[PDB]
Point group: D2
Chain length 58, copies 4
Protein backbone atom coordinates (compact mmCIF):
# COMPACT_ATOMS: atom_id res chain seq x y z
CA UNK A 1 0.00 0.00 0.00
CA UNK A 2 3.32 1.56 0.07
CA UNK A 3 4.11 4.96 -1.63
CA UNK A 4 7.80 4.01 -1.68
CA UNK A 5 9.77 0.81 -1.53
CA UNK A 6 13.20 -0.17 -0.28
CA UNK A 7 16.01 1.36 -2.30
CA UNK A 8 13.95 4.21 -3.78
CA UNK A 9 15.94 7.47 -3.93
CA UNK A 10 13.99 10.28 -2.23
CA UNK A 11 14.47 13.76 -0.90
CA UNK A 12 12.80 15.96 1.66
CA UNK A 13 10.57 18.47 -0.12
CA UNK A 14 11.13 21.48 2.07
CA UNK A 15 12.87 22.87 5.14
CA UNK A 16 15.99 21.05 6.33
CA UNK A 17 17.39 18.92 3.52
CA UNK A 18 17.73 15.13 3.37
CA UNK A 19 18.36 12.85 0.38
CA UNK A 20 19.19 9.19 -0.06
CA UNK A 21 17.63 5.71 -0.19
CA UNK A 22 14.60 4.24 1.61
CA UNK A 23 15.95 1.77 4.15
CA UNK A 24 12.87 1.16 6.31
CA UNK A 25 9.46 2.12 7.46
CA UNK A 26 7.42 2.97 10.53
CA UNK A 27 3.87 3.61 11.54
CA UNK A 28 2.38 5.68 14.43
CA UNK A 29 -0.95 7.50 14.94
CA UNK A 30 0.78 10.80 14.15
CA UNK A 31 2.57 9.32 11.15
CA UNK A 32 0.62 6.33 9.81
CA UNK A 33 2.99 6.00 6.83
CA UNK A 34 6.64 6.85 7.56
CA UNK A 35 10.00 5.93 6.07
CA UNK A 36 13.61 5.64 7.14
CA UNK A 37 16.06 7.20 4.66
CA UNK A 38 19.79 6.71 4.68
CA UNK A 39 21.70 9.80 3.56
CA UNK A 40 23.59 9.41 0.32
CA UNK A 41 26.00 12.12 1.48
CA UNK A 42 26.65 10.83 5.02
CA UNK A 43 26.82 7.05 4.87
CA UNK A 44 25.22 5.31 7.92
CA UNK A 45 23.17 8.40 8.91
CA UNK A 46 19.44 7.70 8.83
CA UNK A 47 16.46 9.95 9.40
CA UNK A 48 12.78 8.96 9.61
CA UNK A 49 10.04 11.11 8.00
CA UNK A 50 6.36 11.01 7.22
CA UNK A 51 5.58 10.15 3.57
CA UNK A 52 4.20 13.63 2.94
CA UNK A 53 7.64 15.12 3.64
CA UNK A 54 9.36 13.12 0.91
CA UNK A 55 9.37 12.81 -2.86
CA UNK A 56 10.97 10.25 -5.15
CA UNK A 57 13.75 11.45 -7.48
CA UNK A 58 15.71 9.71 -10.19
CA UNK B 1 14.14 -13.34 11.38
CA UNK B 2 13.11 -10.56 13.55
CA UNK B 3 14.33 -10.16 17.21
CA UNK B 4 11.31 -7.95 17.91
CA UNK B 5 7.92 -7.44 16.37
CA UNK B 6 5.50 -4.55 16.11
CA UNK B 7 4.04 -3.53 19.45
CA UNK B 8 6.78 -5.08 21.60
CA UNK B 9 7.68 -2.86 24.57
CA UNK B 10 11.45 -2.24 24.64
CA UNK B 11 13.99 0.01 26.26
CA UNK B 12 17.46 1.22 25.47
CA UNK B 13 19.98 -0.76 27.52
CA UNK B 14 22.46 1.97 28.29
CA UNK B 15 23.38 5.62 27.82
CA UNK B 16 20.56 8.01 26.91
CA UNK B 17 17.22 6.47 27.84
CA UNK B 18 14.36 5.49 25.52
CA UNK B 19 11.34 3.25 26.18
CA UNK B 20 8.15 2.45 24.33
CA UNK B 21 6.72 0.27 21.54
CA UNK B 22 8.28 -1.03 18.31
CA UNK B 23 6.63 0.86 15.47
CA UNK B 24 8.94 0.01 12.56
CA UNK B 25 12.18 -1.26 11.25
CA UNK B 26 15.14 -0.37 9.08
CA UNK B 27 18.21 -1.93 7.59
CA UNK B 28 21.59 -0.41 6.56
CA UNK B 29 25.14 -1.82 6.26
CA UNK B 30 26.02 -0.18 9.58
CA UNK B 31 22.80 -1.40 11.20
CA UNK B 32 21.53 -4.51 9.40
CA UNK B 33 18.74 -4.97 11.97
CA UNK B 34 17.25 -1.74 13.34
CA UNK B 35 13.95 -0.71 14.89
CA UNK B 36 11.82 2.40 15.27
CA UNK B 37 10.45 2.87 18.80
CA UNK B 38 7.74 5.30 19.77
CA UNK B 39 8.24 6.77 23.24
CA UNK B 40 5.62 5.77 25.77
CA UNK B 41 6.35 9.00 27.67
CA UNK B 42 6.30 11.43 24.72
CA UNK B 43 3.56 10.33 22.35
CA UNK B 44 4.47 10.76 18.63
CA UNK B 45 8.23 10.92 19.32
CA UNK B 46 10.11 8.12 17.58
CA UNK B 47 13.76 7.12 17.67
CA UNK B 48 15.50 4.46 15.57
CA UNK B 49 18.15 2.14 17.09
CA UNK B 50 20.15 -0.93 16.24
CA UNK B 51 18.78 -4.16 17.79
CA UNK B 52 21.82 -4.50 20.04
CA UNK B 53 20.89 -1.23 21.78
CA UNK B 54 17.46 -2.47 22.85
CA UNK B 55 15.91 -5.07 25.11
CA UNK B 56 12.33 -6.26 25.47
CA UNK B 57 10.55 -5.56 28.79
CA UNK B 58 7.15 -6.54 30.08
CA UNK C 1 18.27 38.12 23.61
CA UNK C 2 17.30 34.73 24.66
CA UNK C 3 13.61 33.58 24.98
CA UNK C 4 14.75 30.80 27.32
CA UNK C 5 17.73 30.16 29.52
CA UNK C 6 19.54 27.10 30.76
CA UNK C 7 17.46 25.00 33.13
CA UNK C 8 14.07 26.36 32.02
CA UNK C 9 11.43 23.61 31.86
CA UNK C 10 9.74 23.62 28.44
CA UNK C 11 7.53 21.47 26.28
CA UNK C 12 6.83 21.10 22.60
CA UNK C 13 3.56 22.85 21.77
CA UNK C 14 2.20 20.45 19.20
CA UNK C 15 2.79 17.27 17.23
CA UNK C 16 5.26 14.77 18.69
CA UNK C 17 5.73 15.44 22.39
CA UNK C 18 8.91 16.52 24.21
CA UNK C 19 9.34 17.97 27.71
CA UNK C 20 12.29 18.71 29.95
CA UNK C 21 15.03 21.27 30.64
CA UNK C 22 16.92 23.63 28.30
CA UNK C 23 20.46 22.31 28.08
CA UNK C 24 21.81 24.26 25.10
CA UNK C 25 21.27 26.35 22.07
CA UNK C 26 21.95 26.56 18.36
CA UNK C 27 21.59 28.94 15.49
CA UNK C 28 21.19 28.33 11.70
CA UNK C 29 19.60 30.32 8.85
CA UNK C 30 16.56 28.03 9.02
CA UNK C 31 16.42 28.24 12.81
CA UNK C 32 18.07 31.46 14.00
CA UNK C 33 17.02 30.76 17.61
CA UNK C 34 17.04 27.08 18.62
CA UNK C 35 17.36 25.15 21.86
CA UNK C 36 18.51 21.75 23.06
CA UNK C 37 16.13 20.14 25.57
CA UNK C 38 16.92 17.13 27.69
CA UNK C 39 13.91 14.90 28.28
CA UNK C 40 12.73 14.75 31.87
CA UNK C 41 11.27 11.30 31.16
CA UNK C 42 14.27 9.77 29.35
CA UNK C 43 17.41 10.98 31.07
CA UNK C 44 20.32 11.71 28.64
CA UNK C 45 18.02 11.99 25.59
CA UNK C 46 18.22 15.42 23.98
CA UNK C 47 16.31 16.95 21.10
CA UNK C 48 16.91 20.32 19.42
CA UNK C 49 13.98 22.55 18.34
CA UNK C 50 13.30 26.02 17.06
CA UNK C 51 12.05 28.46 19.74
CA UNK C 52 8.64 28.69 18.09
CA UNK C 53 8.07 24.97 18.75
CA UNK C 54 8.52 25.30 22.52
CA UNK C 55 6.82 26.91 25.48
CA UNK C 56 7.95 27.36 29.07
CA UNK C 57 5.98 25.53 31.79
CA UNK C 58 6.25 25.56 35.55
CA UNK D 1 36.88 26.13 27.78
CA UNK D 2 35.55 25.17 24.49
CA UNK D 3 37.23 22.53 22.21
CA UNK D 4 35.43 24.04 19.22
CA UNK D 5 33.87 27.36 18.41
CA UNK D 6 31.05 28.53 16.18
CA UNK D 7 31.78 28.07 12.50
CA UNK D 8 34.48 25.41 12.94
CA UNK D 9 34.23 22.69 10.28
CA UNK D 10 34.11 19.25 11.93
CA UNK D 11 33.29 15.67 11.13
CA UNK D 12 32.18 12.62 13.05
CA UNK D 13 35.17 10.35 13.62
CA UNK D 14 33.50 6.99 13.22
CA UNK D 15 30.25 5.15 12.59
CA UNK D 16 27.47 7.07 10.84
CA UNK D 17 28.94 10.07 9.02
CA UNK D 18 28.29 13.77 9.67
CA UNK D 19 30.24 16.83 8.50
CA UNK D 20 29.65 20.56 8.56
CA UNK D 21 29.90 23.65 10.79
CA UNK D 22 29.48 24.07 14.56
CA UNK D 23 26.24 25.96 15.08
CA UNK D 24 25.66 25.47 18.81
CA UNK D 25 26.37 23.69 22.00
CA UNK D 26 24.77 21.74 24.82
CA UNK D 27 25.61 20.28 28.16
CA UNK D 28 24.11 17.30 30.09
CA UNK D 29 25.49 14.89 32.73
CA UNK D 30 25.92 12.25 30.02
CA UNK D 31 27.49 14.75 27.62
CA UNK D 32 29.06 17.62 29.57
CA UNK D 33 30.53 19.11 26.37
CA UNK D 34 28.35 18.71 23.25
CA UNK D 35 27.97 20.53 19.96
CA UNK D 36 25.33 21.11 17.31
CA UNK D 37 26.63 20.69 13.75
CA UNK D 38 24.82 21.76 10.63
CA UNK D 39 25.43 19.43 7.69
CA UNK D 40 27.34 20.98 4.81
CA UNK D 41 25.66 18.49 2.47
CA UNK D 42 22.06 18.88 3.69
CA UNK D 43 21.49 22.54 4.48
CA UNK D 44 19.28 23.12 7.58
CA UNK D 45 19.86 19.59 8.95
CA UNK D 46 21.52 19.66 12.37
CA UNK D 47 22.76 16.88 14.61
CA UNK D 48 24.09 17.17 18.17
CA UNK D 49 27.11 15.10 19.34
CA UNK D 50 29.46 14.80 22.26
CA UNK D 51 32.87 16.45 21.68
CA UNK D 52 34.63 13.09 21.71
CA UNK D 53 32.68 12.05 18.60
CA UNK D 54 33.95 14.96 16.50
CA UNK D 55 37.19 16.24 15.04
CA UNK D 56 38.03 19.55 13.38
CA UNK D 57 38.99 19.48 9.68
CA UNK D 58 40.17 22.18 7.33
N1 LIG E 1 16.53 9.23 12.36
C1 LIG E 1 17.17 9.86 13.20
O1 LIG E 1 17.68 9.18 14.07
C2 LIG E 1 17.06 11.31 13.39
C3 LIG E 1 18.10 11.94 14.13
C4 LIG E 1 18.06 13.34 14.34
C5 LIG E 1 16.97 14.02 13.79
N2 LIG E 1 16.01 13.34 13.03
C6 LIG E 1 14.86 13.91 12.53
O2 LIG E 1 15.28 14.77 11.43
C7 LIG E 1 14.30 15.72 11.21
C8 LIG E 1 14.67 16.96 11.68
O3 LIG E 1 13.62 17.48 11.48
P1 LIG E 1 13.63 18.06 10.15
O4 LIG E 1 13.92 19.55 10.40
O5 LIG E 1 14.83 17.42 9.45
O6 LIG E 1 12.25 17.80 9.44
P2 LIG E 1 10.79 17.73 9.96
O7 LIG E 1 10.66 18.73 10.93
O8 LIG E 1 10.13 16.39 10.13
O9 LIG E 1 9.82 18.06 8.99
C9 LIG E 1 13.18 15.62 12.20
O10 LIG E 1 12.09 15.00 11.46
C10 LIG E 1 13.88 14.75 13.20
O11 LIG E 1 12.93 13.89 13.50
C11 LIG E 1 16.01 11.96 12.85
N1 LIG F 1 14.25 8.93 15.27
C1 LIG F 1 14.58 10.12 15.36
O1 LIG F 1 14.09 10.85 14.52
C2 LIG F 1 15.70 10.60 16.17
C3 LIG F 1 15.73 11.98 16.47
C4 LIG F 1 16.79 12.51 17.25
C5 LIG F 1 17.76 11.60 17.68
N2 LIG F 1 17.64 10.23 17.39
C6 LIG F 1 18.58 9.28 17.69
O2 LIG F 1 18.52 9.08 19.14
C7 LIG F 1 19.72 8.55 19.57
C8 LIG F 1 20.50 9.48 20.22
O3 LIG F 1 21.45 8.78 20.33
P1 LIG F 1 21.37 8.07 21.59
O4 LIG F 1 22.30 8.88 22.52
O5 LIG F 1 19.92 8.23 22.04
O6 LIG F 1 21.83 6.58 21.39
P2 LIG F 1 22.89 5.90 20.49
O7 LIG F 1 24.00 6.76 20.48
O8 LIG F 1 22.46 5.18 19.25
O9 LIG F 1 23.39 4.69 21.01
C9 LIG F 1 20.71 8.42 18.46
O10 LIG F 1 20.72 6.99 18.14
C10 LIG F 1 20.02 9.31 17.47
O11 LIG F 1 20.15 8.60 16.36
C11 LIG F 1 16.63 9.71 16.59
N1 LIG G 1 18.47 15.95 19.20
C1 LIG G 1 18.44 14.84 18.64
O1 LIG G 1 19.51 14.29 18.53
C2 LIG G 1 17.30 14.36 17.86
C3 LIG G 1 17.25 12.97 17.60
C4 LIG G 1 16.17 12.43 16.85
C5 LIG G 1 15.20 13.34 16.42
N2 LIG G 1 15.28 14.70 16.77
C6 LIG G 1 14.44 15.68 16.32
O2 LIG G 1 13.16 15.47 17.01
C7 LIG G 1 12.15 16.06 16.29
C8 LIG G 1 11.38 15.14 15.62
O3 LIG G 1 10.73 15.93 15.02
P1 LIG G 1 9.55 16.26 15.80
O4 LIG G 1 8.45 15.39 15.15
O5 LIG G 1 9.85 15.74 17.20
O6 LIG G 1 9.27 17.80 15.71
P2 LIG G 1 9.46 18.86 14.59
O7 LIG G 1 9.10 18.22 13.39
O8 LIG G 1 10.62 19.80 14.66
O9 LIG G 1 8.58 19.95 14.69
C9 LIG G 1 12.64 16.64 15.00
O10 LIG G 1 12.69 18.08 15.24
C10 LIG G 1 13.97 15.95 14.96
O11 LIG G 1 14.77 16.93 14.59
C11 LIG G 1 16.36 15.24 17.46
N1 LIG H 1 20.02 16.81 15.95
C1 LIG H 1 19.09 16.09 15.57
O1 LIG H 1 17.99 16.58 15.65
C2 LIG H 1 19.21 14.64 15.35
C3 LIG H 1 18.20 14.02 14.58
C4 LIG H 1 18.26 12.62 14.33
C5 LIG H 1 19.35 11.94 14.88
N2 LIG H 1 20.35 12.63 15.58
C6 LIG H 1 21.40 12.04 16.24
O2 LIG H 1 22.32 11.57 15.20
C7 LIG H 1 23.11 10.57 15.71
C8 LIG H 1 22.74 9.33 15.25
O3 LIG H 1 23.48 8.72 15.95
P1 LIG H 1 24.73 8.52 15.24
O4 LIG H 1 24.62 7.08 14.70
O5 LIG H 1 24.69 9.51 14.08
O6 LIG H 1 25.94 8.72 16.23
P2 LIG H 1 26.14 8.42 17.74
O7 LIG H 1 25.52 7.18 17.98
O8 LIG H 1 26.07 9.53 18.73
O9 LIG H 1 27.49 8.20 18.09
C9 LIG H 1 22.74 10.22 17.12
O10 LIG H 1 23.79 10.83 17.93
C10 LIG H 1 21.41 10.89 17.14
O11 LIG H 1 21.44 11.48 18.33
C11 LIG H 1 20.28 13.99 15.88
Amino acid sequence: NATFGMGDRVRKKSGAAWQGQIVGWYCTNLTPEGYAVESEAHPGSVHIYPVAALERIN
